[PDB]
From Swiss-Prot, chain A:
Organism the protein comes from: Human immunodeficiency virus type 1 group M subtype B (isolate BH10)
Effect of W229A: Complete loss of RNA-dependent DNA polymerase activity. No effect on RNA 5'-end and 3'-end cleavages
Effect caused by changing Y232A: Complete loss of RNA-dependent DNA polymerase activity. Complete loss of RNA 5'-end and 3'-end cleavages
Miscellaneous: Error-prone enzyme that lacks a proof-reading function. High mutations rate is a direct consequence of this characteristic. RT also displays frequent template switching leading to high recombination rate. Recombination mostly occurs between homologous regions of the two copackaged RNA genomes. If these two RNA molecules derive from different viral strains, reverse transcription will give rise to highly recombinated proviral DNAs.
Recorded consequence of changing V189A: 37% increase of DNA-directed DNA polymerase activity. No loss of RNA-directed DNA polymerase activity
Motif Tryptophan repeat motif per record, residues: 398-414
Cellular location(s): Virion
Effect listed in the UniProt record for changing W410L: No effect on RT p66/p51 heterodimerization
Entry protein name: Reverse transcriptase/ribonuclease H
Outcome of substituting L74V: No loss of polymerase activity. No loss of RNase H activity
Substitution effect: H539 to D/N: Severely reduces exonuclease activity of RNase H. Probably also reduces substrate binding affinity. Modifies cleavage preferences of RNase H. No effect on the endonuclease activity
Length: 552, 426
């Protein structure tokens, strides 16, 4: 820890100045612990006693390490962090296991004293000043300032990362073969070389890092495969998620649930069939982390299925750039889809689910297309290309649905997989009026205060009908009048409404809805042989429409 | 001497901090190459972690030399560096441009690369070539010269442009020359051959006395608009509202007609549906055929009349922005309206290409957007804000697959209501 690496210039935000937080003295031993820690640091160059001049100050403290012979210095830069300039945000994302490529040997190197090994911009040191209190309210206390990246400062992560990158730049160019992943203070070195030649290069890298003030592990690696990494378990030829453990409770809190779902979604990367619709449906209502929540019948029926799936262990495989990417998707049940991405029969790179409706009402095609989109984005992120899709829908089905759809959609090349349940259109509306079909003029109306309503129809055959409705809305009665017409008509019917709202819902051909009434209308539409739905401007003297408007 | 022009951001505004979109390994490899060279050439420089800004970069093809090209999305930076340069009283957009027989668009973006960029401003032009699967942190760079795509580039080069074009304009007083960002729009009423000849004199003039470089988009291969980018605005149509011509009308036909006419009434005051509705009196089967009355056509035919001459009492206001809505019409056809206030269309139009070999909705929409934007620039001097009838995610995934322009408009995503009916054709 004495790196000759050029420093990164740093600045306090515009207008602001150093922090002047007073140190509140403490324990006899705690001050002694600091002096001993700081004297050892001073010897190492990590910090330097500053003159009586002017450095500002940041509170210091000292803690019992989780081992009791050694104590730990601790600085609370919260105030400095606030006055310090923004930095290029360090990698918020993380490399996904199914994106790594097969390697014969992989070594893990931990940099030691990572931060304390990189120098701090000379001009910025003065703002890191701190003081360890005195014997006890007597002597002034000693003033110190950092000369290296302080363990809790804002710029330490990014500056360290960039310095590491620069240090590795020459080595990675003299070894286009070796791959190195940087993550925090860890370095994962992999290669397709003979265990003896590999171990060779590793020692090389080590000496290189060492000549730049970076110390790596002694047995050359305190690396023992499988590596437990970020909720993952990586083996030389496969990867999985670390031991998932679902808690059994009697009273579940909002907090208990969120934690459950989170873990479930994490299992979802490799465990096929995980579902979290109902457990989530039952969640964000309001944000009490502690407001106990009564477990729904479905939520428990869902939680049960999840437990069974998690019973037998599953693993994922690594990426082979040679072979290509394939994605398969299968419908599940009720707005739920699951998928897997692979290269070889029986070897999953990873799995996933798609349970987003994107609206009150939808249909399988439109949801299927969205699932394709999410996967495509994920594939590009993880592998850098799009996969070949295998979908439970025939070219005709999809072909029909979009030539008609008012929106623009697109799907990379795909293949029809005949493995029910297949995606399909349960009903299609006529594009022209039927001839020997009774024509129903429907209308619905509601009182905005009493919320009482009416729904009815008048047909050309002379039939009229009105039905009373309770606790309803204008829009709700409009859908109900249509439902009414469908119920009283034959296998073929022409329906005329003045509701753009009800038009828009049905003309979008939905096969499932969050609305109970819409699902009933849908059930009726499927029963029907031919249904032609039409719209006309309300209160415009259109015969048929005027008569029924006055009725309701 | 490095004569850089002091540039600053809008008061009380900080640089852009936009996230880089993940890119295909293919596009990443292209960017790495292009940047490695720009770096060797001194146009850009690697930056450190003390720079926190970011602007999205993309990799496109100007239609296939099988070359790649970098496209920086400075939409955010432009909005913070400039609606204040001297953004309102230099040479605003000329009006005869949309009346010329031929307007050729030439890319003069390579000029900028010569002028060094202001020291204190560079930091604000930082971008990131992404890594695949977060394997390594992205490669970060910032510009050392005026970047193509930034709205301050043309403004800072302005003086130099007007100086180079002087002689040329002094000898061709009947050629309008309008600049918009990275492009020059040259219009005339000459004959195609002369017009084209004259464009060639301009190119060579920029080349030799500019020691500026306009690319030579040699003439057509496939049948339509290929040399520079050859427009013919004097031939731009308007897609008026059309009412069906009928053999036999059914109750359902008149109902649809009354609905459309009713809707139109919010634009054309003269439209009337009185004598037309009377034929619907009574609750009849939609099929029932009904003879148009005598007063009907006296009303219908009168409507077709009003619906021919685009409305008036609609003026372009430069303080408000233009809005373009597009609707999928099927069969590779697309309609659109440019406006500023609902029901006050400055223009209406259509766009279509259905059966060449290779086309899909995204590609179509992508070309329609570039077509509308170009017409928009020619007619008003600015690009509009688009209300795209596609899903955000999808558009974001594929638009760069067919984008060829050097500029990028604002856009938002919408869900078109069944009024496509009130706009469709034949
Ligand atoms: C802790 C850790 C994290 C990551 C993201 C990669 C890594 O080593 C790897 C691994 C996996 S680590 C386990 C392993 C690989 C071989 C033996 O054991 C793979 C598949 N491919 C590589 O290119 C590298 I570098 C090791
Ligand atoms: O070509 C894939 C083909 O093999 C099957 C089994 O017949 O799928 C196997 O491999 C998948 C991933 O590699 C697993 O998700 C699946 O559970 C396993 O049976 C077929 O389903 C598939 O068509
Ligand atoms: O594509 C939408 C997406 O792009 C971002 C940048 O990542 O913003 C850009 O597009 C917006 C809409 O056109 C502009 O308002 C903005 O100037 C531009 O950067 C995202 O903000 C937006 O979600
Ligand atoms: Mn009504």
């Amino acid at each position: 820890p004495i790196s000759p690496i050029e420093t990164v210039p740093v600045k306090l935000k515009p207008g602001m100045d150093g922090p002047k937080v007073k140190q509140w003295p403490l324990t006899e031993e705690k001050i002694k612990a600091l002096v001993e820690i700081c004297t050892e640091m001073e010897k190492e160059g990590k910090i330097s006693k500053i003159g009586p001049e002017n450095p500002y100050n940041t509170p210091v403290f000292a803690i019992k390490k989780k081992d009791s012979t050694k104590w730990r210095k601790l600085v609370d830069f919260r105030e400095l962090n606030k006055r310090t300039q923004d930095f290029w945000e360090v990698q918020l994302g993380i490399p996904h296991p199914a994106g790594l490529k097969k390697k014969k040997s992989v070594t893990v190197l931990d940099v030691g004293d990572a931060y304390f090994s990189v120098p701090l911009d000379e001009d910025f040191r003065k703002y890191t000043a701190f003081t360890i209190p005195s014997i006890n309210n007597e002597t002034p206390g000693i003033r110190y300032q950092y000369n290296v990246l302080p363990q809790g400062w804002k710029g330490s992560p990014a500056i360290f990362q960039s310095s590491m990158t620069k240090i590795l730049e020459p080595f990675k160019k003299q070894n286009p073969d070796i791959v190195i992943y940087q993550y925090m203070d860890d370095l994962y070195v992999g290669s397709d070389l003979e265990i003896g030649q590999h171990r060779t290069k590793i020692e090389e890298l080590r000496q290189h890092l060492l000549r730049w003030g970076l110390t790596t592990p002694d047995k050359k690696h305190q690396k023992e495969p499988p590596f437990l990494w970020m909720g993952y378990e990586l083996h030389p030829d496969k990867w999985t998620v670390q031991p998932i453990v679902l808690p059994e409770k009697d009273s579940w809190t909002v907090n208990d649930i969120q934690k459950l779902v989170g873990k479930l979604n994490w299992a979802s990367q490799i465990y096929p069939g995980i579902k979290v619709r109902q457990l989530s449906k039952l969640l964000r209502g309001t944000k009490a982390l502690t407001e106990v929540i009564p477990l729904t019948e479905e939520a428990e029926l869902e939680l049960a299925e999840n437990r069974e799936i998690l019973k037998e262990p599953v693993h994922g495989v690594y990426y082979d750039p040679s072979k290509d990417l394939i994605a398969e998707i299968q419908k599940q049940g009720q707005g739920q889809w699951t998928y897997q991405i692979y290269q070889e029969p029986f070897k999953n790179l990873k799995t996933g689910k798609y349970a987003r409706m994107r609206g009150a009402h939808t249909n399988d095609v439109k949801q299927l297309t969205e699932a394709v989109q999410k996967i495509t984005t994920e594939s590009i992120v993880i592998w850098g290309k799009t996969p070949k899709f295998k979908l439970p829908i025939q070219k005709e089905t999809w072909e029909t649905w979009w030539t008609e759809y008012w929106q623009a959609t697109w799907i990379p090349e795909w293949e029809f997989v005949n493995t029910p349940p297949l995606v399909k259109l349960w009903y299609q509306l006529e594009k022209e009026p039927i001839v020997g079909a009774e024509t129903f003029y429907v209308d619905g109306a509601a009182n905005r205060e009493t919320k009482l309503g009416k729904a009815g129809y008048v047909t050309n055959k002379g039939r009229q009908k009105v039905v009373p409705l309770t606790n309803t809305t204008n829009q709700k009665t409009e859908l109900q009048a249509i439902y009414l017409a469908l119920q009283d008509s034959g296998l073929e019917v022409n329906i005329v409404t003045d509701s753009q709202y009800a038009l828009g819902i049905i003309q979008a051909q939905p096969d499932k809805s969050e609305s109970e009434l819409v699902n009933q209308i849908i059930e009726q539409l499927i029963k029907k042989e031919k249904v032609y739905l039409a719209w006309v401007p309300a209160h415009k003297g259109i015969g048929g429409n005027e008569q029924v408007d006055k009725l309701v | 001497p490095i004569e850089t022009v002091p540039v600053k951001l809008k008061p009380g505004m900080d640089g852009p901090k936009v996230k880089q979109w993940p890119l295909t390994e293919e596009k990443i490899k292209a960017l790495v190459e292009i940047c490695t060279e720009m770096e060797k050439e001194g146009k850009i420089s690697k930056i450190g972690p003390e720079n926190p800004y970011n602007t999205p970069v993309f990799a496109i093809k100007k239609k296939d030399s099988t070359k790649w090209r970098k496209l920086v999305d400075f939409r955010e930076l432009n909005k913070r560096t400039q609606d204040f340069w001297e953004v309102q009283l230099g040479i605003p957009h000329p009006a005869g441009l949309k009346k010329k027989k031929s307007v050729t668009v030439l890319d003069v973006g390579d000029a900028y690369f010569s002028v060094p960029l202001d020291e204190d401003f560079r930091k604000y032009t930082a971008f990131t070539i992404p890594s695949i699967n977060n394997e390594t942190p992205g490669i970060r760079y910032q510009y050392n010269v005026l970047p193509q795509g930034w709205k301050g580039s043309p403004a800072i080069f302005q003086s130099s442009m007007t100086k180079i074009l002087e002689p040329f304009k002094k000898q061709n007083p009947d050629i309008v020359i309008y600049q918009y960002m990275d492009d020059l729009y040259v219009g005339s009423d000459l004959e195609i051959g002369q017009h084209r000849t004259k464009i060639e004199e301009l190119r060579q003039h920029l080349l030799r006395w500019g020691l500026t470089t306009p690319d030579k988009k040699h003439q057509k291969e496939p049948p339509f608009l290929w040399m520079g980018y050859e427009l013919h605005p004097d031939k731009w149509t308007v897609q008026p509202i059309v009412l069906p011509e009928k053999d036999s009308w059914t109750v359902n036909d008149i109902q649809k007609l009354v609905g459309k006419l009713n809707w139109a009434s919010q634009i054309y005051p003269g439209i009337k549906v009185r004598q037309l509705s009377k034929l619907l009196r009574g609750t009849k089967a939609l099929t029932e055929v009904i003879p148009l009355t005598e007063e009907a056509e006296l009303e219908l035919a009168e409507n077709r009349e009003i619906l021919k001459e685009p409305v008036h009492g609609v003026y372009y206001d430069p303080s408000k922005d233009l809005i373009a809505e597009i609707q999928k019409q099927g069969q590779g056809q697309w309609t659109y309206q440019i406006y500023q206030e609902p029901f006050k269309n400055l223009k209406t139009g259509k766009y279509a290409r259905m059966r060449g070999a290779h086309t899909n909705d995204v590609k179509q929409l992508t070309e329609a957007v570039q077509k509308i934007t170009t017409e928009s620039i020619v007619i008003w001097g600015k690009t509009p804000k688009f209300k795209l009838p596609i899903q955000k995610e999808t558009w974001e995934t594929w638009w760069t697959e067919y984008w060829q322009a050097t500029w990028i408009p604002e856009w938002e995503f919408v869900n078109t209501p069944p009024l496509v009916k009130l706009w469709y054709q034949l």
